[PDB]
Amino acid sequence: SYGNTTFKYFQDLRNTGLEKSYALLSGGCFPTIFSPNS
Amino acid sequence: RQRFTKNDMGDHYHWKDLNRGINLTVYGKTFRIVDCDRFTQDFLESQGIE
Amino acid sequence: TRLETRTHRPNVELCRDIAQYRLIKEIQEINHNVARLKETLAQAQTQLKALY
Amino acid sequence: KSQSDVNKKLEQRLEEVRFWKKELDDKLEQLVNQTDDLLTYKTRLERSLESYKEIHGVMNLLIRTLEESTEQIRLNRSAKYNLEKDLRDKFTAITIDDVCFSLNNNSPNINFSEKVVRIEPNSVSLEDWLDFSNANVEKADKQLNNSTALKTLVDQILSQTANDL
Amino acid sequence: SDRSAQHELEKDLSDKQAALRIDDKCQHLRNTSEGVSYFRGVERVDATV
């Protein structure tokens, strides 16, 4: 539903935090997610 | 009859990605769409695609 | 004319509603009154025969 | 007396259909404005995308955001098409019924019908009619909500990334 | 003569009310409308009395 698409972007908010965290120091350990792709 | 592999991961051309006058590669050989027909026009515009 | 013309509404634009109902009732009353009037004419001409 | 009563109910139908068509017009024009704005935001996005050829995460993120934008605008003008066809058919009905109203006891080209006195299959009732209209309208409104939220969203994401760099 | 006058005024009224119908729809347009079309040409067009 639309609420769930907004929620998809809410995961995308966590993901924006995730890529910003992925743009941190190396000691900070973080994985890749499904968002990167070809 | 089978599904056509858009990209590497295994995606399918989900018809939401087809307008007039676009190209596409399918197992090597690449093609260019020209035009369409009455029912296709009506259905695609009902879905909304310009 | 009215009931005929209100038959060319494309797709879902037809309502079979209270206007239709009462128009049908109007047709009924027209026919019924015409019948009564013709009957009365019959009686009238017969008794005129008697007068002659 | 009977003739006058028929007149009345004709005007009743006229007025009600007119009100509904005006509602339809209002909602459609609002949606048109919103679609315009979303397309403008798409333009801004692709501008930034091409600019950053001059770190890598932002490229994939912005491509994906453009994807969801495409899906949103998709839904929006699908709803737009539904509402437009509804509007055109409503007006088609209203003009003909008004033509039927105009007639009197002396207008020309008046004749007999042959066989109409029955009820045809594929006919509906008032509440079903109203629910059809109501459903289409409320769907359009939901889509408007869609558009507003995603506008705000895109502005947030662009400003955030810009400040990040 | 009465019948003659009736027929004349009747056809006048019919064409005229059709004309009002037309001009109602003429007004019944608004910016960002549906019936819009890229027709061309008919600007220097007329045949009127």
Side-chain angles (χ1 to χ4, degrees):
Chain A
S1 85
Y2 170 67
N4 307 322
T5 55
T6 62
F7 194 10
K8 163 85 196 212
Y9 175 75
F10 301 165
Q11 290 89 20
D12 305 335
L13 269 166
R14 277 77 59 86
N15 303 334
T16 55
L18 279 172
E19 319 320 304
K20 293 200 203 64
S21 79
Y22 206 94
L24 294 174
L25 80 167
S26 57
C29 293
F30 285 131
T32 60
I33 62 182
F34 66 89
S35 160
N37 62 6
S38 168
Chain B
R1 207 178 191 186
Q2 64 185 357
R3 268 170 139 186
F4 293 2
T5 305
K6 187 158 157 208
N7 200 357
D8 51 352
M9 73 291 291
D11 48 344
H12 307 294
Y13 289 95
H14 186 265
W15 56 267
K16 291 281 267 210
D17 48 22
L18 316 165
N19 191 352
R20 293 191 173 178
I22 312 303
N23 302 268
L24 73 165
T25 300
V26 181
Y27 300 145
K29 187 57 187 66
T30 302
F31 314 91
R32 165 70 164 279
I33 299 166
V34 184
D35 278 312
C36 58
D37 45 351
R38 56 193 203 286
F39 180 86
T40 291
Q41 296 181 357
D42 305 331
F43 169 91
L44 274 296
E45 62 84 23
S46 67
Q47 306 325 296
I49 193 66
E50 301 75 12
Chain C
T1 48
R2 286 217 194 201
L3 269 295
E4 199 283 330
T5 60
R6 287 187 97 233
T7 47
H8 299 348
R9 290 96 69 201
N11 83 357
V12 54
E13 288 310 320
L14 73 165
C15 314
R16 73 152 75 76
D17 51 26
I18 57 172
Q20 307 275 106
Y21 285 100
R22 201 169 47 75
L23 267 295
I24 292 292
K25 306 163 57 59
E26 201 273 350
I27 318 303
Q28 307 155 4
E29 55 80 19
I30 290 175
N31 306 325
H32 190 272
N33 310 140
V34 171
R36 278 220 303 281
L37 258 182
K38 293 190 306 295
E39 173 269 339
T40 54
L41 180 58
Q43 278 66 235
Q45 44 81 16
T46 49
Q47 192 187 7
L48 165 72
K49 192 68 66 69
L51 273 76
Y52 283 95
Chain D
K1 294 300 299 172
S2 51
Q3 193 59 38
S4 63
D5 189 4
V6 190
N7 297 119
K8 292 188 291 174
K9 302 230 282 198
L10 266 292
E11 294 88 5
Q12 287 318 97
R13 301 274 163 74
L14 170 61
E15 173 276 341
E16 171 269 346
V17 189
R18 293 185 288 112
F19 150 80
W20 281 95
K21 65 90 176 179
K22 183 185 189 61
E23 290 290 328
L24 291 170
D25 166 35
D26 312 334
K27 283 302 187 302
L28 188 136
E29 57 207 356
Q30 270 176 290
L31 182 143
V32 164
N33 294 302
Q34 291 325 284
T35 287
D36 298 332
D37 288 345
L38 272 299
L39 192 56
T40 63
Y41 273 33
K42 170 168 299 297
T43 68
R44 177 168 68 233
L45 271 171
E46 57 81 17
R47 297 300 332 298
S48 46
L49 274 296
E50 56 81 17
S51 65
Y52 280 163
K53 65 97 176 180
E54 212 280 337
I55 283 185
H56 294 89
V58 304
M59 309 285 187
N60 298 278
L61 304 171
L62 270 69
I63 300 154
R64 291 291 291 247
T65 53
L66 187 152
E67 181 275 337
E68 289 100 10
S69 176
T70 317
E71 179 53 58
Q72 182 41 241
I73 52 169
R74 176 65 170 168
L75 265 174
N76 307 138
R77 78 288 185 275
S78 66
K80 179 252 166 186
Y81 176 52
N82 281 334
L83 278 294
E84 197 289 323
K85 67 178 71 66
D86 218 341
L87 196 53
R88 84 173 82 97
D89 204 326
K90 303 321 280 181
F91 156 75
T92 291
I94 199 68
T95 179
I96 291 299
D97 68 44
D98 178 73
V99 162
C100 302
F101 165 93
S102 51
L103 182 144
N104 75 340
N105 296 115
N106 299 66
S107 65
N109 311 116
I110 304 194
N111 286 274
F112 292 167
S113 299
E114 282 53 42
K115 179 58 187 81
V116 69
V117 177
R118 69 170 293 267
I119 58 168
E120 188 69 28
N122 191 248
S123 169
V124 302
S125 79
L126 307 170
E127 65 290 33
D128 216 358
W129 193 59
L130 315 177
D131 277 334
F132 160 66
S133 73
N134 202 357
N136 218 2
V137 174
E138 62 90 21
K139 292 186 283 279
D141 291 331
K142 198 78 181 173
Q143 288 316 283
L144 275 181
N145 304 123
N146 281 50
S147 296
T148 310
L150 292 203
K151 288 202 55 61
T152 68
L153 202 66
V154 160
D155 287 321
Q156 263 274 348
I157 200 72
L158 291 192
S159 66
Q160 190 169 31
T161 289
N163 186 12
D164 299 331
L165 184 61
Chain E
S1 60
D2 295 311
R3 297 277 176 102
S4 177
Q6 284 174 177
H7 155 62
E8 305 143 20
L9 307 169
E10 202 180 10
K11 55 181 163 48
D12 308 333
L13 180 142
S14 62
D15 64 59
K16 182 69 176 177
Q17 62 185 356
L20 279 73
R21 162 204 191 185
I22 297 155
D23 293 282
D24 301 328
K25 191 49 154 199
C26 296
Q27 183 284 320
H28 292 323
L29 204 64
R30 178 260 184 197
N31 276 309
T32 75
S33 78
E34 59 289 1
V36 286
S37 302
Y38 291 168
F39 78 95
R40 328 155 308 159
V42 287
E43 309 75 50
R44 325 306 175 104
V45 289
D46 189 281
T48 315
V49 285

Coordinates of all heavy atoms in Angstrom, one line a residue, chain D residues 32-98:
Chain D
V32 N -3.4 17.7 -11.4 CA -2.6 18.2 -12.6 C -1.5 19.0 -12.0 O -0.3 18.8 -12.4 CB -3.5 19.0 -13.6 CG1 -2.6 19.7 -14.5 CG2 -4.4 18.0 -14.3
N33 N -1.8 20.0 -11.2 CA -0.7 20.8 -10.6 C 0.4 20.0 -10.0 O 1.6 20.2 -10.2 CB -1.3 21.8 -9.6 CG -2.2 22.8 -10.3 OD1 -1.8 23.6 -11.2 ND2 -3.4 22.9 -9.8
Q34 N -0.1 19.0 -9.1 CA 0.9 18.2 -8.4 C 1.8 17.4 -9.3 O 3.1 17.3 -9.1 CB 0.2 17.3 -7.4 CG -0.4 18.1 -6.3 CD 0.4 19.3 -5.9 OE1 1.4 19.2 -5.2 NE2 0.0 20.5 -6.3
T35 N 1.3 16.8 -10.4 CA 2.1 16.1 -11.4 C 3.1 17.0 -12.0 O 4.3 16.6 -12.2 CB 1.2 15.5 -12.4 OG1 0.5 14.3 -11.9 CG2 2.1 15.0 -13.6
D36 N 2.7 18.2 -12.3 CA 3.7 19.2 -12.9 C 4.9 19.3 -11.9 O 6.1 19.2 -12.4 CB 3.0 20.5 -13.1 CG 1.9 20.5 -14.1 OD1 1.9 19.6 -15.0 OD2 0.9 21.3 -13.9
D37 N 4.6 19.5 -10.7 CA 5.7 19.8 -9.7 C 6.6 18.5 -9.6 O 7.9 18.7 -9.6 CB 5.2 20.1 -8.3 CG 4.6 21.5 -8.3 OD1 4.9 22.3 -9.2 OD2 3.9 21.8 -7.3
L38 N 6.1 17.3 -9.6 CA 6.9 16.1 -9.5 C 7.8 16.0 -10.7 O 9.0 15.7 -10.5 CB 6.0 14.9 -9.4 CG 5.6 14.5 -7.9 CD1 6.9 14.2 -7.1 CD2 4.8 15.5 -7.2
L39 N 7.3 16.3 -11.9 CA 8.2 16.2 -13.0 C 9.4 17.2 -12.9 O 10.5 16.9 -13.3 CB 7.4 16.5 -14.3 CG 8.2 16.1 -15.6 CD1 8.7 14.7 -15.5 CD2 7.4 16.3 -16.8
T40 N 9.1 18.4 -12.4 CA 10.2 19.4 -12.2 C 11.2 18.8 -11.3 O 12.4 19.0 -11.5 CB 9.6 20.7 -11.7 OG1 9.0 20.5 -10.4 CG2 8.6 21.3 -12.6
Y41 N 10.8 18.1 -10.2 CA 11.8 17.5 -9.3 C 12.6 16.5 -10.0 O 13.8 16.3 -9.7 CB 11.1 17.0 -8.1 CG 10.9 18.0 -7.0 CD1 10.6 19.4 -7.3 CD2 10.9 17.7 -5.7 CE1 10.5 20.3 -6.4 CE2 10.7 18.7 -4.7 CZ 10.5 20.0 -5.1 OH 10.3 20.9 -4.1
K42 N 12.0 15.7 -10.9 CA 12.7 14.7 -11.6 C 13.8 15.4 -12.4 O 15.0 14.9 -12.4 CB 11.8 14.0 -12.6 CG 12.6 13.1 -13.6 CD 11.7 12.2 -14.4 CE 11.0 11.2 -13.5 NZ 12.0 10.3 -12.8
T43 N 13.5 16.5 -13.1 CA 14.6 17.3 -13.8 C 15.7 17.6 -12.9 O 16.9 17.4 -13.2 CB 14.0 18.5 -14.4 OG1 13.6 19.4 -13.4 CG2 12.8 18.2 -15.2
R44 N 15.4 18.2 -11.7 CA 16.5 18.6 -10.8 C 17.4 17.4 -10.4 O 18.6 17.5 -10.4 CB 15.9 19.2 -9.5 CG 17.1 19.5 -8.5 CD 16.7 20.4 -7.3 NE 15.9 19.7 -6.4 CZ 14.7 20.2 -6.0 NH1 14.2 21.3 -6.4 NH2 14.0 19.5 -5.1
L45 N 16.7 16.3 -10.1 CA 17.5 15.1 -9.8 C 18.5 14.8 -10.9 O 19.7 14.7 -10.6 CB 16.5 13.9 -9.6 CG 16.0 13.8 -8.1 CD1 14.9 12.7 -8.0 CD2 17.2 13.4 -7.2
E46 N 18.0 14.5 -12.1 CA 18.9 14.1 -13.1 C 20.0 15.1 -13.4 O 21.2 14.8 -13.7 CB 18.2 13.8 -14.4 CG 17.4 14.9 -15.0 CD 18.2 15.9 -15.8 OE1 19.4 15.5 -16.2 OE2 17.7 17.0 -16.1
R47 N 19.7 16.4 -13.2 CA 20.8 17.4 -13.2 C 21.9 17.1 -12.2 O 23.1 17.1 -12.6 CB 20.2 18.8 -13.0 CG 19.2 19.3 -14.0 CD 19.8 19.3 -15.4 NE 21.2 19.6 -15.5 CZ 21.8 20.7 -15.1 NH1 21.1 21.7 -14.6 NH2 23.1 20.8 -15.3
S48 N 21.5 16.9 -11.0 CA 22.6 16.6 -10.0 C 23.3 15.3 -10.3 O 24.5 15.2 -10.1 CB 21.9 16.5 -8.6 OG 20.7 15.7 -8.6
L49 N 22.6 14.3 -10.8 CA 23.2 13.1 -11.2 C 24.4 13.3 -12.2 O 25.5 12.8 -12.0 CB 22.2 12.1 -11.8 CG 21.4 11.1 -10.9 CD1 22.3 10.1 -10.2 CD2 20.5 11.9 -9.9
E50 N 24.1 14.0 -13.3 CA 25.1 14.2 -14.3 C 26.2 15.1 -13.7 O 27.4 15.0 -14.1 CB 24.5 14.8 -15.6 CG 23.7 16.1 -15.4 CD 24.6 17.3 -15.3 OE1 25.8 17.2 -15.7 OE2 24.2 18.4 -14.9
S51 N 25.9 16.1 -12.8 CA 26.9 16.9 -12.3 C 27.9 16.2 -11.5 O 29.1 16.5 -11.6 CB 26.2 18.0 -11.4 OG 25.7 17.4 -10.2
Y52 N 27.5 15.2 -10.7 CA 28.6 14.6 -9.8 C 29.6 13.7 -10.6 O 30.3 13.0 -9.9 CB 27.9 13.8 -8.7 CG 27.5 14.6 -7.6 CD1 26.5 14.1 -6.6 CD2 27.9 15.9 -7.4 CE1 26.1 14.9 -5.6 CE2 27.5 16.7 -6.3 CZ 26.6 16.2 -5.4 OH 26.2 16.9 -4.4
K53 N 29.6 13.7 -11.9 CA 30.8 13.0 -12.5 C 32.1 13.7 -12.3 O 33.1 13.1 -12.5 CB 30.5 12.8 -14.0 CG 30.5 14.1 -14.8 CD 31.9 14.4 -15.5 CE 31.8 15.6 -16.3 NZ 33.2 15.9 -17.0
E54 N 32.1 14.9 -11.8 CA 33.3 15.8 -11.7 C 33.9 15.7 -10.3 O 34.8 14.8 -10.1 CB 32.9 17.2 -12.0 CG 34.0 18.0 -12.7 CD 35.0 18.5 -11.6 OE1 34.7 18.6 -10.4 OE2 36.2 18.8 -12.0
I55 N 32.7 8.1 -1.7 CA 31.9 9.0 -2.6 C 30.8 8.2 -3.3 O 29.7 8.7 -3.4 CB 32.8 9.7 -3.6 CG1 33.6 10.8 -2.9 CG2 32.0 10.2 -4.7 CD1 34.4 11.6 -3.9
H56 N 31.1 7.0 -3.8 CA 30.3 6.4 -4.8 C 28.9 6.1 -4.4 O 28.0 5.9 -5.3 CB 31.0 5.1 -5.2 CG 32.3 5.2 -5.9 ND1 33.5 5.3 -5.2 CD2 32.7 5.4 -7.2 CE1 34.5 5.5 -6.0 NE2 34.1 5.5 -7.2
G57 N 28.6 6.0 -3.1 CA 27.3 5.6 -2.7 C 26.2 6.5 -3.3 O 25.1 6.0 -3.7
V58 N 26.4 7.8 -3.3 CA 25.4 8.7 -3.8 C 24.9 8.4 -5.2 O 23.7 8.6 -5.5 CB 25.9 10.2 -3.7 CG1 26.3 10.4 -2.3 CG2 27.0 10.4 -4.7
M59 N 25.7 7.8 -6.0 CA 25.3 7.5 -7.4 C 24.2 6.5 -7.4 O 23.1 6.7 -7.9 CB 26.5 7.1 -8.2 CG 27.7 7.9 -8.1 SD 27.5 9.5 -9.1 CE 29.2 10.1 -8.9
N60 N 24.4 5.4 -6.7 CA 23.4 4.3 -6.6 C 22.1 4.8 -5.9 O 21.0 4.6 -6.3 CB 24.0 3.1 -5.9 CG 25.1 2.5 -6.7 OD1 24.9 1.7 -7.6 ND2 26.3 2.8 -6.3
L61 N 22.3 5.6 -4.8 CA 21.2 6.1 -4.1 C 20.3 7.0 -4.9 O 19.1 6.8 -4.9 CB 21.6 6.8 -2.8 CG 22.5 6.0 -1.9 CD1 23.1 6.8 -0.8 CD2 21.8 4.8 -1.3
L62 N 20.9 7.9 -5.7 CA 20.1 8.8 -6.5 C 19.4 8.1 -7.7 O 18.3 8.4 -8.0 CB 21.0 10.0 -6.9 CG 21.0 11.1 -5.9 CD1 21.7 10.8 -4.7 CD2 21.6 12.4 -6.6
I63 N 20.1 7.1 -8.3 CA 19.4 6.3 -9.3 C 18.2 5.7 -8.7 O 17.1 5.7 -9.3 CB 20.4 5.3 -9.9 CG1 21.6 6.0 -10.5 CG2 19.7 4.5 -11.0 CD1 22.9 5.1 -10.6
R64 N 18.3 5.0 -7.6 CA 17.2 4.3 -7.0 C 16.1 5.3 -6.7 O 14.9 5.0 -6.9 CB 17.6 3.5 -5.8 CG 18.5 2.3 -6.2 CD 17.7 1.3 -6.9 NE 16.8 0.6 -6.1 CZ 16.9 -0.7 -5.7 NH1 17.8 -1.5 -6.1 NH2 15.9 -1.2 -4.9
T65 N 16.4 6.5 -6.1 CA 15.4 7.5 -5.8 C 14.6 7.9 -7.1 O 13.4 8.0 -7.1 CB 16.0 8.7 -5.2 OG1 17.1 9.2 -6.0 CG2 16.5 8.3 -3.8
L66 N 15.4 8.1 -8.2 CA 14.7 8.4 -9.4 C 13.7 7.2 -9.8 O 12.6 7.5 -10.4 CB 15.7 8.6 -10.5 CG 15.3 9.1 -11.9 CD1 16.4 9.8 -12.6 CD2 14.8 7.9 -12.8
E67 N 14.1 6.0 -9.5 CA 13.2 4.9 -9.8 C 11.9 5.0 -9.0 O 10.8 4.9 -9.6 CB 13.9 3.5 -9.5 CG 13.1 2.3 -9.7 CD 12.2 1.9 -8.6 OE1 12.4 2.3 -7.5 OE2 11.2 1.2 -8.9
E68 N 12.0 5.2 -7.7 CA 10.7 5.3 -7.0 C 9.9 6.5 -7.4 O 8.7 6.5 -7.4 CB 11.0 5.4 -5.5 CG 11.4 4.1 -4.8 CD 12.9 4.0 -4.6 OE1 13.6 5.0 -4.7 OE2 13.3 2.9 -4.2
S69 N 10.6 7.6 -7.8 CA 9.9 8.8 -8.4 C 9.1 8.4 -9.6 O 8.0 8.8 -9.8 CB 10.9 9.9 -8.7 OG 10.2 11.0 -9.3
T70 N 9.7 7.6 -10.5 CA 9.0 7.1 -11.7 C 7.8 6.3 -11.3 O 6.7 6.5 -11.9 CB 10.0 6.3 -12.5 OG1 11.3 6.9 -12.6 CG2 9.4 6.1 -13.9
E71 N 7.9 5.4 -10.3 CA 6.7 4.6 -9.9 C 5.6 5.5 -9.4 O 4.4 5.3 -9.7 CB 7.1 3.6 -8.9 CG 6.0 2.7 -8.4 CD 5.2 2.1 -9.5 OE1 5.8 1.4 -10.3 OE2 4.0 2.3 -9.6
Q72 N 6.0 6.5 -8.6 CA 5.0 7.4 -8.1 C 4.2 8.2 -9.2 O 3.0 8.2 -9.2 CB 5.6 8.4 -7.1 CG 4.6 9.3 -6.4 CD 3.3 8.6 -6.0 OE1 2.3 9.0 -6.5 NE2 3.5 7.6 -5.1
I73 N 5.0 8.8 -10.1 CA 4.3 9.6 -11.1 C 3.4 8.7 -12.0 O 2.3 9.1 -12.4 CB 5.3 10.4 -12.0 CG1 6.4 9.5 -12.5 CG2 5.9 11.5 -11.2 CD1 7.3 10.1 -13.5
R74 N 3.9 7.5 -12.2 CA 3.1 6.4 -12.9 C 1.7 6.3 -12.3 O 0.7 6.5 -12.9 CB 3.9 5.1 -12.7 CG 3.3 3.8 -13.2 CD 3.1 3.8 -14.6 NE 2.7 2.5 -15.1 CZ 2.3 2.3 -16.4 NH1 2.1 3.2 -17.2 NH2 2.1 1.0 -16.8
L75 N 1.7 6.0 -10.9 CA 0.4 5.9 -10.3 C -0.4 7.1 -10.4 O -1.7 7.1 -10.7 CB 0.6 5.6 -8.8 CG 0.6 4.1 -8.4 CD1 0.9 3.9 -6.9 CD2 -0.8 3.5 -8.7
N76 N 0.2 8.3 -10.3 CA -0.6 9.6 -10.3 C -1.3 9.7 -11.6 O -2.6 9.9 -11.6 CB 0.4 10.7 -10.1 CG 1.2 10.6 -8.9 OD1 2.4 10.9 -8.9 ND2 0.6 10.1 -7.8
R77 N -0.7 9.6 -12.8 CA -1.5 9.9 -14.0 C -2.3 8.7 -14.4 O -3.3 8.9 -15.2 CB -0.6 10.4 -15.2 CG 0.2 9.4 -16.0 CD 1.4 9.0 -15.2 NE 2.3 8.1 -15.9 CZ 2.2 6.8 -16.0 NH1 1.2 6.2 -15.5 NH2 3.1 6.1 -16.8
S78 N -2.1 7.5 -13.9 CA -3.1 6.4 -14.0 C -4.4 6.9 -13.4 O -5.5 6.8 -14.1 CB -2.6 5.1 -13.4 OG -2.5 5.3 -12.0
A79 N -4.3 7.3 -12.2 CA -5.5 7.8 -11.5 C -6.1 9.0 -12.4 O -7.4 9.1 -12.5 CB -5.2 8.3 -10.1
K80 N -5.3 9.8 -12.9 CA -5.7 10.9 -13.7 C -6.6 10.4 -14.9 O -7.7 11.0 -15.2 CB -4.6 11.7 -14.2 CG -4.9 12.9 -15.1 CD -4.5 12.6 -16.5 CE -5.2 13.6 -17.5 NZ -5.0 13.3 -18.9
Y81 N -6.1 9.4 -15.6 CA -6.9 8.9 -16.7 C -8.3 8.4 -16.3 O -9.3 8.6 -16.9 CB -6.1 7.8 -17.4 CG -6.9 7.1 -18.5 CD1 -7.5 7.9 -19.5 CD2 -7.0 5.7 -18.6 CE1 -8.2 7.3 -20.6 CE2 -7.7 5.1 -19.6 CZ -8.3 5.9 -20.6 OH -9.0 5.3 -21.6
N82 N -8.3 7.6 -15.2 CA -9.6 7.1 -14.7 C -10.6 8.3 -14.5 O -11.7 8.3 -14.9 CB -9.4 6.4 -13.4 CG -8.9 4.9 -13.6 OD1 -9.1 4.4 -14.7 ND2 -8.2 4.4 -12.6
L83 N -10.1 9.3 -13.7 CA -11.0 10.4 -13.5 C -11.5 11.1 -14.7 O -12.6 11.5 -14.9 CB -10.4 11.4 -12.5 CG -10.4 11.1 -11.0 CD1 -11.8 11.2 -10.5 CD2 -9.8 9.8 -10.7
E84 N -10.6 11.3 -15.7 CA -11.0 11.9 -16.9 C -12.1 11.2 -17.7 O -13.0 11.8 -18.1 CB -9.7 12.1 -17.9 CG -9.9 13.2 -18.9 CD -10.9 12.8 -20.0 OE1 -10.9 11.6 -20.4 OE2 -11.6 13.6 -20.5
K85 N -11.9 9.9 -17.8 CA -13.0 9.2 -18.5 C -14.3 9.3 -17.8 O -15.4 9.5 -18.4 CB -12.7 7.7 -18.8 CG -12.6 6.8 -17.5 CD -12.3 5.4 -17.9 CE -10.9 5.2 -18.4 NZ -9.9 5.4 -17.3
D86 N -14.3 9.2 -16.5 CA -15.5 9.4 -15.7 C -16.2 10.7 -16.0 O -17.4 10.8 -16.3 CB -15.2 9.3 -14.2 CG -16.3 8.6 -13.4 OD1 -17.4 8.5 -14.0 OD2 -16.0 8.1 -12.3
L87 N -15.3 11.8 -16.0 CA -15.8 13.1 -16.3 C -16.5 13.2 -17.6 O -17.6 13.8 -17.8 CB -14.7 14.2 -16.1 CG -15.1 15.6 -16.0 CD1 -16.0 15.9 -14.8 CD2 -13.8 16.5 -15.8
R88 N -15.8 12.7 -18.6 CA -16.4 12.9 -20.0 C -17.7 12.2 -20.1 O -18.7 12.7 -20.7 CB -15.4 12.4 -21.1 CG -15.4 10.9 -21.3 CD -14.5 10.6 -22.5 NE -13.1 10.5 -22.2 CZ -12.5 9.3 -21.9 NH1 -13.2 8.2 -22.0 NH2 -11.2 9.3 -21.6
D89 N -17.8 11.0 -19.5 CA -19.1 10.3 -19.6 C -20.2 11.0 -18.9 O -21.4 11.0 -19.3 CB -18.9 8.8 -19.2 CG -20.0 7.9 -19.8 OD1 -21.1 8.3 -20.0 OD2 -19.6 6.7 -20.1
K90 N -19.9 11.6 -17.7 CA -20.9 12.3 -17.0 C -21.5 13.5 -17.8 O -22.7 13.6 -17.9 CB -20.3 12.9 -15.7 CG -19.7 11.9 -14.7 CD -20.5 10.6 -14.7 CE -21.8 10.7 -13.8 NZ -22.5 9.4 -13.7
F91 N -20.6 14.2 -18.4 CA -21.1 15.3 -19.3 C -21.9 14.8 -20.4 O -22.9 15.4 -20.8 CB -19.9 16.2 -19.8 CG -20.3 16.9 -21.0 CD1 -21.1 18.0 -21.0 CD2 -19.8 16.5 -22.3 CE1 -21.5 18.7 -22.1 CE2 -20.2 17.2 -23.4 CZ -21.0 18.3 -23.4
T92 N -21.5 13.7 -21.0 CA -22.2 13.1 -22.1 C -23.7 12.8 -21.6 O -24.6 13.1 -22.4 CB -21.6 11.8 -22.6 OG1 -20.3 12.1 -23.3 CG2 -22.5 11.1 -23.5
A93 N -23.8 12.3 -20.4 CA -25.1 12.0 -19.9 C -25.9 13.3 -19.7 O -27.1 13.4 -20.1 CB -25.1 11.2 -18.6
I94 N -25.3 14.3 -19.2 CA -26.0 15.5 -18.8 C -26.6 16.3 -20.0 O -27.7 16.8 -19.9 CB -25.2 16.4 -17.8 CG1 -26.1 17.4 -17.1 CG2 -24.1 17.2 -18.6 CD1 -26.9 16.7 -16.0
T95 N -25.8 16.3 -21.0 CA -26.3 17.1 -22.2 C -27.5 16.5 -22.8 O -28.5 17.1 -23.1 CB -25.2 17.3 -23.2 OG1 -25.7 18.0 -24.4 CG2 -24.6 15.9 -23.7
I96 N -27.5 15.1 -22.9 CA -28.6 14.4 -23.5 C -29.9 14.6 -22.6 O -31.0 14.8 -23.1 CB -28.3 13.0 -23.7 CG1 -27.3 12.9 -24.9 CG2 -29.5 12.1 -24.1 CD1 -27.8 13.4 -26.2
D97 N -29.7 14.4 -21.3 CA -30.9 14.5 -20.4 C -31.5 15.9 -20.5 O -32.7 16.1 -20.4 CB -30.6 14.1 -19.0 CG -29.6 15.0 -18.3 OD1 -29.7 16.2 -18.3 OD2 -28.7 14.5 -17.6
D98 N -30.6 17.0 -20.6 CA -31.1 18.3 -20.7 C -31.9 18.5 -22.0 O -32.9 19.2 -22.1 CB -30.0 19.3 -20.6 CG -30.5 20.8 -20.8 OD1 -31.1 21.3 -19.9 OD2 -30.2 21.3 -21.9

